[PDB]
Amino acid sequence: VPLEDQIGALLGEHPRQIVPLHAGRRAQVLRCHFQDGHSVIVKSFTRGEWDALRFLAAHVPAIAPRPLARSKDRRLVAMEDLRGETLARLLERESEAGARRPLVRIADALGHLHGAQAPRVDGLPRALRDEYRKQADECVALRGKVRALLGRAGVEPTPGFDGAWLELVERMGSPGPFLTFTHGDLAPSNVLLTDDGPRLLDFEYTGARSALYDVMFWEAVVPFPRSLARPMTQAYRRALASHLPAARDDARFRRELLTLKTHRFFWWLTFRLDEALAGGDAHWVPGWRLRPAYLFYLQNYVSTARRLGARGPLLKTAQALSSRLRRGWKERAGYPDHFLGKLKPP
């Protein structure tokens, strides 16, 4: 059965036009236009967004597309076609000062999402409820991957690394009161600014995790200057703490922030560092060269972790790698092109 006919059967009516938007590794995203102009998004697979959209359908203020239909073999998923300005487009045209209010609004909306859904997290399907347990399991194996990669970079872990890693694993496996619904893959392309507030798209990586896992969006993943990341985390925390008493505790929140940032640094180091060491032309994402990106990630982790009171073997090992790669690479830490104007170098 042709895809167009499959979609028509799914929706109960034939779209006048099916426009491919994004080809992902797992799914094609399609905008389907009805004869009257109305549109929906269909994702075609050739797997928990559907369950996430169902789970969030009563969350207010609305933050996600409503689920519309899923085929019997689950290969086609239809959801609302939410429109707005992507955060990616906003960051390309705004100044730091001009981006602060929408970024604070996003951070606030995410804190309310995490806080409102923390008492509800057991209603997720079992595979999604268990996500933090699976990632903590994988954290154990990540130690050896990190040690081997550091060796290829010429750097040995500082004394006490393994004991400090065991503490990281234990923290990563005990989100406790911070356990909540997380989107899992927040990025400038899947956050919208709309006239009715922020919206989130692309829930493929939804799982039950520490609330702070999603905060890595601006604390560790997208290279926001600290002049924006700090007010975002403060606005996020005020919203989360309105729901969650544990977030009102300065030391508990700081510890959770530090755990997830430390995990993020060492986990994402394994993605492309070997490629960066080899030195071929490469990008972290389009517009952001790979060596400036890792130098940013190294500097941002060391500096912000130190501010959060980190002073152990994991920080010292990151410091040693930073010093090596700064000497070895002629490149400097930098920001992406077309990103909040002319930023002072990090």
Partner: peptide, 9 residues
């Protein structure tokens, strides 16, 4: 992934 990609294998 898809603000970053892991070289999975």
């Amino acid at each position: 992934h898809x603000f970053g990609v892991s070289v999975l294998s």
